[PDB]
Design a protein around this nucleic acid. Structure first.
Ligand SMILES: [Mg+2]
Ligand SMILES: [Mg+2]
Ligand SMILES: [Mg+2]
Ligand SMILES: [Mg+2]
Ligand SMILES: [Mg+2]
Ligand SMILES: [Mg+2]
Ligand SMILES: [Mg+2]
Ligand SMILES: [Mg+2]
Ligand SMILES: [Mg+2]
Ligand SMILES: [Mg+2]
Ligand SMILES: [Mg+2]
Ligand SMILES: [Mg+2]
Ligand SMILES: [Mg+2]
Ligand SMILES: [Mg+2]
Ligand SMILES: [Mg+2]
Ligand SMILES: [Mg+2]
Ligand SMILES: [Mg+2]
Ligand SMILES: [Mg+2]
Ligand SMILES: [Mg+2]
Ligand SMILES: [Mg+2]
Ligand SMILES: [Mg+2]
Ligand SMILES: [Mg+2]
Ligand SMILES: [Mg+2]
Ligand SMILES: [Mg+2]
Ligand SMILES: [Mg+2]
Ligand SMILES: [Mg+2]
Ligand SMILES: [Mg+2]
Ligand SMILES: [Mg+2]
Ligand SMILES: [Mg+2]
Ligand SMILES: [Mg+2]
Ligand SMILES: [Mg+2]
Ligand SMILES: [Mg+2]
Ligand SMILES: [Mg+2]
Ligand SMILES: [Mg+2]
Ligand SMILES: [Mg+2]
Ligand SMILES: [Mg+2]
Ligand SMILES: [Mg+2]
Ligand SMILES: [Mg+2]
Ligand SMILES: [Mg+2]
Ligand SMILES: [Mg+2]
Ligand SMILES: [Mg+2]
Ligand SMILES: [Mg+2]
Ligand SMILES: [Mg+2]
Ligand SMILES: [Mg+2]
Ligand SMILES: [Mg+2]
Ligand SMILES: [Mg+2]
Ligand SMILES: [Mg+2]
Ligand SMILES: [Mg+2]
Ligand SMILES: [Mg+2]
Ligand SMILES: [Mg+2]
Ligand SMILES: [Mg+2]
Ligand SMILES: [Mg+2]
Ligand SMILES: [Mg+2]
Ligand SMILES: [Mg+2]
Ligand SMILES: [Mg+2]
Ligand SMILES: [Mg+2]
Ligand SMILES: [Mg+2]
Ligand SMILES: [Mg+2]
Ligand SMILES: [Mg+2]
Ligand SMILES: [Mg+2]
Ligand SMILES: [Mg+2]
Ligand SMILES: [Mg+2]
Ligand SMILES: [Mg+2]
Ligand SMILES: [Mg+2]
Ligand SMILES: [Mg+2]
Ligand SMILES: [Mg+2]
Ligand SMILES: [Mg+2]
Ligand SMILES: [Mg+2]
Ligand SMILES: [Mg+2]
Ligand SMILES: [Mg+2]
Ligand SMILES: [Mg+2]
Ligand SMILES: [Mg+2]
Ligand SMILES: [Mg+2]
Ligand SMILES: [Mg+2]
Ligand SMILES: [Mg+2]
Ligand SMILES: [Mg+2]
Ligand SMILES: [Mg+2]
Ligand SMILES: [Mg+2]
Ligand SMILES: [Mg+2]
Ligand SMILES: [Mg+2]
Ligand SMILES: [Mg+2]
Ligand SMILES: [Mg+2]
Ligand SMILES: [Mg+2]
Ligand SMILES: [Mg+2]
Ligand SMILES: [Mg+2]
Ligand SMILES: [Mg+2]
Ligand SMILES: [Mg+2]
Ligand SMILES: [Mg+2]
Ligand SMILES: [Mg+2]
Ligand SMILES: [Mg+2]
Ligand SMILES: [Mg+2]
Ligand SMILES: [Mg+2]
Ligand SMILES: [Mg+2]
Ligand SMILES: [Mg+2]
Ligand SMILES: [Mg+2]
Ligand SMILES: [Mg+2]
Ligand SMILES: [Mg+2]
Ligand SMILES: [Mg+2]
Ligand SMILES: [Mg+2]
Ligand SMILES: [Mg+2]
Ligand SMILES: [Mg+2]
Ligand SMILES: [Mg+2]
Ligand SMILES: [Mg+2]
Ligand SMILES: [Mg+2]
Ligand SMILES: [Mg+2]
Ligand SMILES: [Mg+2]
Ligand SMILES: [Mg+2]
Ligand SMILES: [Mg+2]
Ligand SMILES: [Mg+2]
Ligand SMILES: [Mg+2]
Ligand SMILES: [Mg+2]
Ligand SMILES: [Mg+2]
Ligand SMILES: [Mg+2]
Ligand SMILES: [Mg+2]
Ligand SMILES: [Mg+2]
Ligand SMILES: [Mg+2]
Lengths: 122, 218, 227
RNA sequence: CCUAAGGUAGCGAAAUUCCUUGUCGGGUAAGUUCCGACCUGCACGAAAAGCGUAACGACCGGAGCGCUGUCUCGGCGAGGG
RNA sequence: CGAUGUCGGCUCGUCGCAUCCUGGGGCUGAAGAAGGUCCCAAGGGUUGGGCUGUUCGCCCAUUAAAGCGGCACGCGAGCUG
RNA sequence: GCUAGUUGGUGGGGUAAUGGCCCACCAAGGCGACGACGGGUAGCCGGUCUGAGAGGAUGGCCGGCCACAGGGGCACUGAGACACGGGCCCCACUCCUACGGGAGGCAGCAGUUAGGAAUCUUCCGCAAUGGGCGCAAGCCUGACGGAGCGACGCCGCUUG
RNA sequence: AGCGCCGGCCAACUCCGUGCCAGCAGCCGCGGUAAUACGGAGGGCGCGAGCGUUACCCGGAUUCACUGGGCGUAAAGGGC
RNA sequence: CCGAGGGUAGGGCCCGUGACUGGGGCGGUCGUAACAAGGUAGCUGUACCGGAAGGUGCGGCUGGA
RNA sequence: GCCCGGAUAGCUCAGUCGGUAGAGCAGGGGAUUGAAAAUCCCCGUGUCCUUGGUUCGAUUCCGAGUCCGGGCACCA
RNA sequence: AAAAUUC
């Protein structure tokens, strides 16, 4: 359940370490973003010589969340962090690896790029 | 003296010294059919050019042609979306051909607050230049974020003015706490503001950050 | 051919490089102005235009009437133009064979002094640049000089292809009649025009045909970045 | 021209700056506040002291971390009414 | 005037239409898609955050849209100060 | 100005073997303007260039020693390695994958690419010399013998 | 058969072009209408499958002086 | 146990940069300090003062009669 | 807005108490100087801010305006 | 024992 203010740990080699969510991109006034939803976010930590420098404002899709998400078959999955992956408008990663698992729900949501790049899609 | 350049027009030596100019007027051949010629020709009367003759190719009768010399700038703009939208998308042009011009060069300068802007400086026909000038300044107002004084926008060449733009300032505040209403207390706060909407003008250096994709692109 | 206008950058010059161009017309949309305008371009050169009438697979499509229209309108032999349909295995079947014959194959001595002009060029080559054209006359290959007509400036041969449709392929040298590609070190892109290629250095064809050549300033003026 | 003589050092949009969110810089995704600068000081300035100053302060500004029912946005539960 | 408690906020609204959006229209210098202008229309909806006591405004990120007035410039025996 | 395994002791551990090489206790020592400690740079010699000489400068080819084998760490086998073309693990990167998982290591000879002002043939042969295994026959040997390209250096010859 | 040079250092000189322009340059310095110094030509010197340039090392540099220098006034005696 | 390494925190040195701000070198305004007793002999350590060179005090030197 | 004061030579300024107006610097002609200053000699020059009124007559006195300068614009 | 600047 990511909302504006939420720092989420970024899981691709774009060169972002942590980003803060500044809007959840889902209508006139969506309250929360979750797995496979897209935010706008400010960049709070950049390893030196990235492409995303600090204070940049990026779009990113939520890949992992601390708040368990429920699935049609009445199972659930929560992760131990909230993670994101920085994309561009075309909705595709500027990264070239993704780190950690990602949630199956990214798949129907068309983020197929991300899903293959993953180490495990739980 | 004679002088060759420069590609980006603003620089060119002052009308104090300047008795010659060149618009590398080409003349082009357009095949067209039938008559789109009436429409077309007049179009090539605005972007002024020069007829030699040319010929009807045989039919399709709507077969036909026209060889015209027009200055490079006028040609370009005037021509493509128009060129067809005029003729209904048939017809065509090729300009190879690079002649030169003795005609008129007039370039107008665009000034914001009087702080002449170099980037917006533009180059056109004396009649067209005269025509464009209104659009530039007027198209300007949406552009320039507000600074504390009535803010001149004007467009002009060599010391006479083709255009005007004025930008409102108005950094009003002050009366917003008077309520009793001596007429004269109301005035006192605007005697300090009238000095302030002046002092700030004489030391005012003003700026516009990008958004020039907007003002003087068009 | 660059599809679209394109302003004639790839529509004509490269028009030079064909033997026959195949004219493709829908039989659903009809015949459009790009369709006709390109014709006289191509009609302009002198070539074998083999017409087509197309889509026919689409049900509603009006096929015969198109040939009819091009008929008076475009002036092509009504009978001569073929029919296929692309989505279908279609009128295709005769397409290649028809082409060869309607199309006379190329001619020039290929060991004769180099006079090579190529329709077009490879993109980027941030690393290195490649070229296409036909060395209609002559041949050039590795251990070569190249000299390209207007000022020079004289670039040696790294290789030539020739790139099989899979991609850009080998060859010892590029030879006459044959249409391929050549290298290398050009890098400048301003001097080059389609009808100017050189040349080994040590002999020069006396005159370029040509298809040339590029233009003087300025368009543009700044392409200044924001932010 | 004038005065008894015309504000020096240092400081300066300041617990003084009116015009005012002056201008430039810093921080922020965004900064009328804060910090650094400039000096057009409406109307600082030298024991009604001037410019600094380590330590101190339930003083008064600005920022960040940590953590939180302050808040999204509220819910349940205990006792006294 | 033997007393009718002030700006702004919060909370709760309700109403006008001179409509911001959404719905129906005519004209267009309406090809289409997008606009512009006037007409009908008040059913519903009209976001989060930076600065400032602010209302206002500027600015960020979005939005179908980020309407404008009235109700003692609504509302302090409802709160805040 | 530097030092707590730091400097010496003892008794162990370990190795082919001496030693704080490592561990426990014991003592308070060890080093430094004759430049410790930190920082910069560098593979070292035989040699080589210059110079009357002293000196200066340099370490390419070759020969000797050292060190490294994508960046790190670890040991196993073994006379010998903590092993370039053996093994294990982490990191970067490349490839395969049925997504569960896997394979990789040219600073060997050719060669590709990048970087650069600039730098060679995906040649030929085991005929020699040398190496390994084998009773031998032989087999392996991009060491090596030669060829190729470049005026890159020296030397020799031509254009009468 | 080519390449460097032809004011001085440094071996090799005349005409024409240019007029502080164009250009040359290691250093002196050349060029502002008779230029052996710029550009060309004739002529000449050097070296020759080469001849020049750049970069770097030693040399000239007894200019870190051990061989082999200095400090009254040139840089240099410490205020005692 | 150790352990490549990853992570947390606090320091140290270096490089790049920055609104602004010193001075420094190379190509009109104000004066005229030095070079002749340079028109007040100069220089000098120091202090204070002054648009600017500089003036003045205290003491020193001759590299001044 | 109200209150006082101002406006005179190119710049900066005196001044009448109603008749023809001054200074200082700039400017100019001369001199001195090899020359440029400094110095010396000689020289101007004004619609005394605009409008109207008083007056034989107005820079002067009277009324209004424009502009400039100083002060006030408070209790909410 | 020199009032007087500059090219
Ligand atoms: Mg945080
Ligand atoms: Mg991660
Ligand atoms: Mg930052
Ligand atoms: Mg920032
Ligand atoms: Mg009121
Ligand atoms: Mg296409
Ligand atoms: Mg169509
Ligand atoms: Mg004062
Ligand atoms: Mg001061
Ligand atoms: Mg200030
Ligand atoms: Mg401020
Ligand atoms: Mg602001
Ligand atoms: Mg401020
Ligand atoms: Mg700011
Ligand atoms: Mg800022
Ligand atoms: Mg910033
Ligand atoms: Mg910013
Ligand atoms: Mg605040
Ligand atoms: Mg400050
Ligand atoms: Mg003050
Ligand atoms: Mg005070
Ligand atoms: Mg006092
Ligand atoms: Mg203080
Ligand atoms: Mg102190
Ligand atoms: Mg303090
Ligand atoms: Mg206290
Ligand atoms: Mg609560
Ligand atoms: Mg409760
Ligand atoms: Mg209870
Ligand atoms: Mg009352
Ligand atoms: Mg009463
Ligand atoms: Mg009562
Ligand atoms: Mg009451
Ligand atoms: Mg508020
Ligand atoms: Mg209505
Ligand atoms: Mg409307
Ligand atoms: Mg409408
Ligand atoms: Mg409508
Ligand atoms: Mg349209
Ligand atoms: Mg429409
Ligand atoms: Mg409604
Ligand atoms: Mg409403
Ligand atoms: Mg808002
Ligand atoms: Mg904040
Ligand atoms: Mg405001
Ligand atoms: Mg809409
Ligand atoms: Mg309301
Ligand atoms: Mg009330
Ligand atoms: Mg009211
Ligand atoms: Mg109220
Ligand atoms: Mg109350
Ligand atoms: Mg209240
Ligand atoms: Mg009440
Ligand atoms: Mg209060
Ligand atoms: Mg209180
Ligand atoms: Mg111990
Ligand atoms: Mg002890
Ligand atoms: Mg020793
Ligand atoms: Mg090394
Ligand atoms: Mg070397
Ligand atoms: Mg060796
Ligand atoms: Mg290794
Ligand atoms: Mg390894
Ligand atoms: Mg290693
Ligand atoms: Mg063994
Ligand atoms: Mg080893
Ligand atoms: Mg190994
Ligand atoms: Mg290997
Ligand atoms: Mg190799
Ligand atoms: Mg190689
Ligand atoms: Mg390469
Ligand atoms: Mg290269
Ligand atoms: Mg070799
Ligand atoms: Mg052998
Ligand atoms: Mg053998
Ligand atoms: Mg040879
Ligand atoms: Mg020579
Ligand atoms: Mg000689
Ligand atoms: Mg020469
Ligand atoms: Mg001559
Ligand atoms: Mg010479
Ligand atoms: Mg000569
Ligand atoms: Mg030889
Ligand atoms: Mg030397
Ligand atoms: Mg000698
Ligand atoms: Mg020596
Ligand atoms: Mg010697
Ligand atoms: Mg020396
Ligand atoms: Mg000696
Ligand atoms: Mg000496
Ligand atoms: Mg002595
Ligand atoms: Mg001393
Ligand atoms: Mg001393
Ligand atoms: Mg460790
Ligand atoms: Mg560690
Ligand atoms: Mg690790
Ligand atoms: Mg700096
Ligand atoms: Mg710094
Ligand atoms: Mg003097
Ligand atoms: Mg003196
Ligand atoms: Mg003197
Ligand atoms: Mg004097
Ligand atoms: Mg003194
Ligand atoms: Mg002064
Ligand atoms: Mg004095
Ligand atoms: Mg004295
Ligand atoms: Mg005056
Ligand atoms: Mg005079
Ligand atoms: Mg005179
Ligand atoms: Mg003379
Ligand atoms: Mg009068
Ligand atoms: Mg009172
Ligand atoms: Mg009040
Ligand atoms: Mg004198
Ligand atoms: Mg002078
Ligand atoms: Mg003199």
């Amino acid at each position: 359940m990511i909302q504006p203010q939420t720092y989420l740990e970024v899981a691709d080699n774009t060169g972002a370490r942590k980003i803060m969510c500044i809007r959840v991109l889902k209508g006139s006034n969506a309250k929360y973003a979750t797995v496979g939803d897209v935010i706008v976010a400010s960049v709070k930590e950049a390893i030196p010589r990235g492409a995303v420098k600090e204070g940049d404002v990026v779009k990113a899709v939520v890949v992992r969340t601390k708040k368990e998400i429920k699935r049609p078959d009445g199972s659930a999955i929560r992760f131990d962090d909230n993670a994101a992956v920085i994309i561009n408008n075309q909705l595709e990663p500027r990264g070239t690896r993704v780190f950690g698992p990602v949630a199956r729900e990214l798949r129907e949501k068309g983020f197929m790029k991300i899903v293959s790049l993953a180490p495990e899609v739980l | 003296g004679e002088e060759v350049e420069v590609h980006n027009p603003a620089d060119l030596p002052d009308p104090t010294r300047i008795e010659e100019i060149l618009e590398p007027y080409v003349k082009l051949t357009i095949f067209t059919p039938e008559e789109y010629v009436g429409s077309l020709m007049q179009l090539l009367q605005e972007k002024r050019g020069r007829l030699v003759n040319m010929n009807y190719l045989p039919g399709a009768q709507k077969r036909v042609e026209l060889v015209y010399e027009a200055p490079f700038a006028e040609i370009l703009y005037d021509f493509h979306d128009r060129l067809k939208s005029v003729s209904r998308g048939y017809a065509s042009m090729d300009y190879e051909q690079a002649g030169y011009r003795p005609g008129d060069l007039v370039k107008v300068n665009v000034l914001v607050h009087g702080e002449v802007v170099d980037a917006l400086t533009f180059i056109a026909h004396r009649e067209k230049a005269y025509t464009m000038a209104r659009a530039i300044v007027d198209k300007l107002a949406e552009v320039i974020p507000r600074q504390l004084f009535e803010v001149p926008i004007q467009a002009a060449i060599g010391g006479k003015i083709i255009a005007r733009a004025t930008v409102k300032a108005l950094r009003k505040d002050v009366l917003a706490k008077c309520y009793g209403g001596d007429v004269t207390r109301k005035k006192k706060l605007l005697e300090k503001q009238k000095e302030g909407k002046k002092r700030l003008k004489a030391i005012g250096k003003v700026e516009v950050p990008q958004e020039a994709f907007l003002a003087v692109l068009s | 051919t660059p599809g679209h206008v394109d302003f004639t950058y790839e529509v004509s010059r490269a028009l030079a490089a064909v033997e026959g161009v195949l004219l493709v017309v829908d039989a659903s949309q009809g015949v459009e102005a790009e369709t006709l305008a390109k014709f006289y371009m191509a009609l302009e050169h002198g070539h074998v235009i083999i017409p087509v009438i197309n889509k026919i697979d689409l049900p509603n499509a009006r096929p015969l009437e198109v040939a009819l229209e091009v008929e008076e309108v475009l002036g092509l032999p009504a009978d001569e133009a073929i029919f296929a349909s692309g989505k279908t295995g279609e009128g295709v079947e005769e397409i290649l064979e028809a082409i060869v014959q309607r199309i006379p194959p190329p001619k020039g001595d290929p060991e004769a002094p180099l006079k090579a002009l190529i329709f077009d060029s490879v993109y980027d080559a941030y690393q290195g640049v490649i070229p296409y054209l036909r060395l209609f006359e002559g041949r050039v290959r590795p251990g070569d000089r190249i000299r390209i007509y207007s000022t020079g400036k004289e670039f040696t041969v790294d290789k030539v292809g020739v790139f099989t449709p899979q991609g850009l392929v080998a060859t010892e040298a590029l030879e006459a009649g044959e249409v391929g590609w050549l290298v290398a070190a050009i890098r400048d892109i301003h001097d080059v025009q389609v009808g100017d290629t050189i040349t080994l250095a040590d002999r020069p064809t006396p005159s370029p045909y040509p298809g040339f050549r590029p233009a003087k300033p300025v368009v543009f003026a700044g392409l200044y970045p924001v932010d």
